[PDB]
Amino acid sequence: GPVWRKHYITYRINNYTPDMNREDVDYAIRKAFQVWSNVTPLKFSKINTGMADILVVFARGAHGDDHAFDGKGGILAHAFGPGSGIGGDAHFDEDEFWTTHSGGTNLFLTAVHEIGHSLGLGHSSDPKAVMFPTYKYVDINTFRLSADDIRGIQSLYG
């Protein structure tokens, strides 16, 4: 499928969920990115202005693509694969309740999953993998990518 063909990649948080403190959304998204840079040659940067490769968006219902959101539960988030414009963009369902912990939907673990997509990974059938399609909360201090995840992204990059 598509990969990014360059090492320096940008992201930009477009708008912030009301559910969390600002610095907490910044930190969840930054930490999620680091999970992928730790196993690839890529370098990520947050830019606050203008066009970014990966636009991080909180939205609800119909929000301008063809992957309409479905109220609370169901579709937690989605993302598009590498490419320009909407390519790489990750959208988070604001009808969910975003958290740092386990009440509601953990933003950090969802963003790790979505960035997986943003970078060109499809889903894995391995339950152990972050790219498995079902959300399950684990203490984010204990989160590690499965060997499956590592084997997929290193197939794509580096």
Ligand SMILES: COc1ccc(CCS(=O)(=O)NCC(=O)NO)cc1
């Ligand atoms: C292991 O951690 C996670 C695994 C999956 C999910 C998202 C599940 S989803 O939104 O309900 N399914 C849509 C989808 O695949 N969009 O990307 C979040 C975290």
Ligand SMILES: [Ca+2]
């Ligand atoms: Ca939903």
Ligand SMILES: [Ca+2]
């Ligand atoms: Ca984009």
Ligand SMILES: [Ca+2]
């Ligand atoms: Ca919300």
Ligand SMILES: [Zn+2]
């Ligand atoms: Zn969308």
Ligand SMILES: [Zn+2]
């Ligand atoms: Zn997914």
